[PDB]
Design a protein around this ligand. Structure first.
Ligand SMILES: N[C@@H](CCC(=O)O)C(=O)O
Ligand SMILES: N[C@@H](CCC(=O)O)C(=O)O
Ligand SMILES: [Zn+2]
Ligand SMILES: [Zn+2]
Ligand SMILES: [Zn+2]
Ligand SMILES: [Zn+2]
Lengths: 258, 258
């Protein structure tokens, strides 16, 4: 009856409200995906409960066991009915879960500490002084692992063998490593996150170069779920009425600190 | 057996080749969607015939008869098996046909003759010396018809009543109208088309302002078609392999003249 919605604590998509300890249920959280969940539910006519993914991951498949983890795993194994999160539409995921048409367009981008002498992925690939990595267990890592493009495969070959590990567990971890490393670590992450952090104090990062690829986030449901059709129409309706653009301005720019 | 593909003459998606008259069947055409059709057919394992939509339109629904025309109508009434074209994914279309995940991202943009005193949509709406319109029977017109945004609804109010008509039957006619109007006509069209034309002789137009919205083109199939699933997985594969980006540079930027 009540739809279980899996999501992930990733700013500004879903964040704990300042006073969450005094609030209950869905009211504990705020953010772009919290706002969007409320609208999808109202347009599709269901009640829902927001739940934070237990392992804190977006999702990947273990090479050995073939088991899915993260939000993808929660849908695949029946622990949640829908995921409303910055979850990237990819071929390997569409093979095991369903996605709506995208609600946000984005691409992989580079985050540097201001003043770092890097302007592009080609620049990162041609040097060794500045380290760089991506989030573990997400679509960005898979992009580099799978790429046949020479620049990106060169980047992958470095990243997969760098020690200590250049991969991080959360976006926040990646941004902190950029901020604390004096220009000697650059972080590869989606343009949406990069753009958001660029407007947050202490205003010491910047996005550089163009996007490396072009993709989308979608609302995900278990394969053949009865909800997929209505959720897809809801995303299209809300895009056409300007809601998605209005939400992006609210959470990225209206609140910008830089 | 042979899959009938509906498409539309729209540069640089589908164009007649230089020496088409000595060529036959699919070989008569070239462009981004021609290459894309060949890739999709190779991955999905079918043979196909390209056919240009009889009425030269993308597709809209007649408000009195409720009959669909254009490429959307060819799908709806069973005259074609698949549409491979710059066809915009929209709510009202998703109600009668199926769409793949998008193969290209885009937005509505403004095209002016160079030197025209217009910088934005708000600029057009606050004056009257320069007329402006959109393509008939497409998603851009409908966007303005349905817009609740003050600047956009106001534009629509002007466009719908304008005399003589500011709407055009083809993109080519819109561009020609901009070029021959001495700065007194501006054209609202998708950013993909705008960006292509800006790079072609006689280099007298320019895209101005940001995109007015964000959406995508998809490969469309009749509702419940056997083809839909494979076609969707194929578009995702092609994007991940970087082929879509390669095609984009081949047809937009390697082909610039200005
Ligand atoms: N949006 C990504 C997570 C972030 C990233 O990989 O950079 C995913 O769905 O895996
Ligand atoms: N891509 C549009 C046609 C061009 C336009 O409306 O600007 C459609 O599918 O309707
Ligand atoms: Zn807390
Ligand atoms: Zn609403
Ligand atoms: Zn001829
Ligand atoms: Zn191929």
């Amino acid at each position: 009856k009540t739809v279980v919605v899996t999501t992930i604590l990733e700013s500004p998509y879903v964040m704990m409200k300042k006073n969450h300890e005094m609030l209950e249920g869905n009211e504990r959280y705020e953010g772009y995906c919290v706002d969007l969940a409320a609208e999808i539910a109202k347009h599709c006519g269901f009640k829902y409960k927001l739940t934070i993914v237990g392992d804190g991951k977006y999702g990947c498949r273990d090479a050995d066991t073939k088991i899915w983890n993260g939000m993808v795993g929660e849908l695949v194994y029946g622990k949640a009915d829908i995921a409303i999160a910055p979850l990237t539409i990819t071929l390997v995921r569409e093979e095991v879960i369903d996605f709506s048409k995208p609600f946000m367009s984005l691409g992989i981008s580079i985050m540097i500490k201001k003043g770092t002498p890097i302007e592009s992925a080609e620049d990162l690939s041609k040097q060794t002084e500045i380290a760089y990595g991506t989030l573990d267990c997400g679509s960005t890592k898979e992009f580099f692992r799978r790429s046949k493009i020479a620049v990106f495969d060169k980047m992958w070959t470095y990243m997969r063998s760098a020690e200590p590990s250049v991969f991080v567990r959360t976006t926040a971890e990646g941004v902190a490593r950029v901020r604390k490393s004096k220009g000697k670590y650059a972080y590869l992450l989606e343009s949406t996150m990069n753009e958001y952090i660029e407007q947050r104090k202490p205003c010491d990062t910047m996005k550089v170069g163009g996007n490396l690829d072009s993709k989308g986030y979608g609302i995900a449901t278990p394969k053949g779920s009865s909800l997929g059709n209505a959720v897809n129409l809801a995303v299209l309706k809300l895009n056409e009425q300007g809601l998605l653009d209005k939400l992006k301005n609210k959470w990225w720019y209206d609140k910008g600190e830089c």
